[PDB]
Structures are given as C-alpha cells and as structure tokens.
A paper describes a structure:
[name] is exquisitely selective for uracil bases located in single- or double-stranded DNA, and it selectively removes uracil by cleaving the N-glycosyl linkage between the base and the deoxyribose, leaving behind an abasic site. As previously reported, [name] forms a single domain structure consisting of an initial left-handed coil of helices followed by a β−α−β structure that forms an internal four-stranded parallel β-sheet with external α-helices. The p56 monomer comprises a three-stranded antiparallel β-sheet with a helix lying along it. The biological dimer is observed to form a six-membered sheet with the helices lying against one another forming a single hydrophobic core.
Protein p56 of bacteriophage [name], when co-expressed with [name]-1 [name] in E. coli, appeared to form a stable complex. Reminiscent of inhibition by ugi, the [name] active site is occupied by p56. However, where ugi achieves this blockade with a distorted edge-on beta strand, p56 almost exclusively uses the alpha helix of one of its monomeric subunits (molecule C). Contacts to the [name] DNA-binding cleft from this p56 helix span Ser32 through Asn42. Several hydroxyl and backbone oxygen interactions closely resemble those formed by the phosphates of the DNA backbone in the kinked conformation exhibited when the uracil base is flipped out. The tightest point of interaction in the p56 complex appears to be the minor groove intercalation loop of [name]. The apical leucine residue fits into a deep pit between the two helices of the inhibitor dimer. This box-sided pit is formed by a rigid interaction of mutually perpendicular pairs of residues from each p56 subunit helix. Glu37 and Tyr40 side chains from p56 molecules C and D, form the walls of the box. In the apo form of [name]-1 [name], Leu214 adopts a conformation similar to that observed in the described complex with p56, with a shift of 0.5 Å in Cα position but with a similar sidechain conformation; this conformation is also similar in apo human [name].
Author numbering:
A (entry chain D): 7 to 55
B (entry chain A): 16 to 244
C (entry chain C): 7 to 56
C-alpha cells in the first residue's frame, strides 16, 4: 500500500486562506478527502512517503 | 480548396458521414486546424494515430446514432486511445473513470455480462456515439491540442447531427460537457450527471442514465441498448 | 472561472520515473486528467494560477 502526505491550501467564503495537513493517507483516502472538500482549492500537494 | 474525397481518404472517414462533415471544409478555421495538426505531427508524438482520429465515424452511420456520450480529449499515453471517448484498446486495463462507468452499467443491470475489458466498440456499433470534443493530444500533456480548432469542427458535426431529427439521447458527464454541449431538452432527451472521475462530488456508480435512456427509447418505439461490454 | 497548473511525477511498470506538465486547466479538467491516470503517482502538485 502506498501512503501519502497530503497538503491543501484552501480559501473560505470570507476570502481567508488556511492550510490543512494529512499524513499517511492512501490514494482512496485522498479521493474521499478531495470529494468532501467544500472550500476553494488554492494548492494541492500529494507526495508518496 | 479543401476537397472531401482527399479529406476522407487521408483520415479513413466513412462517406456515410459526408452530409454532416463536408460543410466544415468551407469554414476557413478548418485549413488552420489541419495545418496545425500536420505541423504538431512532425514536431511531437501525436495521439491517437492518424487512422484512428476519426474511428468514431466507422462503427455506425448518422441515421443509426441513438445516444451521444461527450468526452474531452484522448488518453495521452501510447496504446490507450483509439478514436472513441472513454474507450481503451482491448489489452488495456480500464483507467479509473472508465471503471466507474462500467460499475454504473453493472449497478443499472445486475444481470449484464461484463467482460472486465474497456473496449467500447460494441456500444459504438449499436448507435452509442462516444465523441471527444478534442480529437488529438500531445503524448504526456492533457488538453495540449484543445485550442487548435477541433472543438469548433466537432461542435459543427454535433449541431448538424442534432438538427437531422428530434429524439437523440445526450449523456453529459461533468461541467465541461454540460457547458459546451447544450441541446434543446424539449427536442432531445438530455441527461446530466457529475463526471465518472473518482474525484467527483457524487460516486458515478449511482448514475442511472443507462436505464433512463432505455426507457426513453421504448417510448419512441426504438429497441433498447444492450449495455453489456 | 479559476485556472490551474498540474505537475505529476509518475512511475511506470519498469520502475522508470517521469514528469508530466499540464498547463492552464480548469479544476474540472484536473479531475478528468486524474481519472485517466494509470501509472503510480509519486508526486502531484495542483496550483491556482487565476
């Protein structure tokens, strides 16, 4: 099983940016994570660990 | 300048598609599109190969088309694309979006015999037109040939196909297909869903277009599509 | 209305790694590109450009 470090830079409805960090996710985990994200995507970084 | 006889021989186009495609040769954009395609072919690795670019004209005639499934551009790795949207060559394991399309077929029809393969020629011969708006791509770069004129040319073919007679079924998956192709919903059966990509908001396995399209065909006294593949 | 650049570092069945650069895509286009990806993802970068 490949595991990944997933980083997102998101922007809320007020225009405020923030980072969210996720360690050890599989690609399926990333897909559910991406699918459930509601705020605007500024950056996405997915790296095999 | 651009002659139909030369155009269909160079691209192996079925002449049954002539009334729908030949008027595009009078659009000055077509000459620019062909010269840009000829130039890219000499400077980069272009997919699918030339004989496959218009394979979508070879499985059925315009009068045999029942369903239009819209795609974007071809798969960008050698051996994948063969001129139809979503479909892959027989020896190729189905990529993620195509696996989701096949799971939705199987959920719609639990008794369908699915091969596990991703070659959709069987659907194409049955009047399922699997049409990308962009017909070529540079290897390794998605949407690289998306701004050379293919969507305008293909856009013209779809408009004339839709104008021939009412009653087509359109399956428009994702934002791009829904924004680009807007048929009149009182003339054609227009079906919309999120994209089969695993990254979509809703799982594609829940899509019932295959059943809805078949119930529509029955009301028009047309036999249903066998979605097994 | 947002536009994005997409960079991937992928690995083929022979273990050879290679870069792919996808420029000026909509977020929906990125989602389609991902669903067409078959080789092993080593790195993925998605950045809003406009």
């Amino acid at each position: 099983l490949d595991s990944y470090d997933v980083t997102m830079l998101l922007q809320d409805d007020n225009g405020k940016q923030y980072y969210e960090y996720h360690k050890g996710l599989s690609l399926s985990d990333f897909e559910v994570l991406y699918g459930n994200t509601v705020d605007e995507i500024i950056k996405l970084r997915v790296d095999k660990i | 300048p651009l002659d139909w006889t030369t155009f269909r021989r160079v691209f192996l186009i079925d002449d049954a598609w002539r009334p729908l495609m030949e008027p595009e040769l009078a659009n000055p954009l077509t000459a620019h599109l062909l010269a840009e395609y000829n130039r890219r072919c000499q400077t980069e690795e272009v997919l699918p190969p030339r004989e496959d670019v218009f394979s979508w004209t070879r499985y059925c005639t315009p009068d045999e088309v029942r369903v239009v499934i819209i795609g974007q551009d071809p798969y960008h790795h050698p051996g994948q694309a063969h001129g139809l949207a979503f479909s892959v060559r027989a020896n190729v394991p189905p990529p993620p979006s195509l696996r989701n399309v096949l799971a939705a077929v199987k959920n719609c029809y639990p008794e369908a015999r699915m091969s596990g393969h991703g070659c959709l020629e069987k659907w194409a011969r049955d009047g399922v037109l699997l049409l990308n708006t962009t017909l070529t791509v540079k290897r390794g770069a998605a949407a690289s040939h998306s701004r050379i004129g293919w969507d305008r040319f293909v856009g013209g073919v779809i408009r004339r196909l839709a104008a021939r007679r009412p009653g087509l079924v359109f399956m428009l998956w994702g934002t791009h297909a829904q924004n680009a192709i807007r048929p009149d919903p009182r003339v054609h059966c227009v079906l919309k869903f999120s994209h089969p990509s695993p990254l979509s908001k809703v799982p594609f396995g829940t899509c019932q277009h295959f059943l809805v399209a078949n119930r529509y065909l029955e009301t028009r006294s047309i036999s249903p599509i066998d979605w097994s593949v």
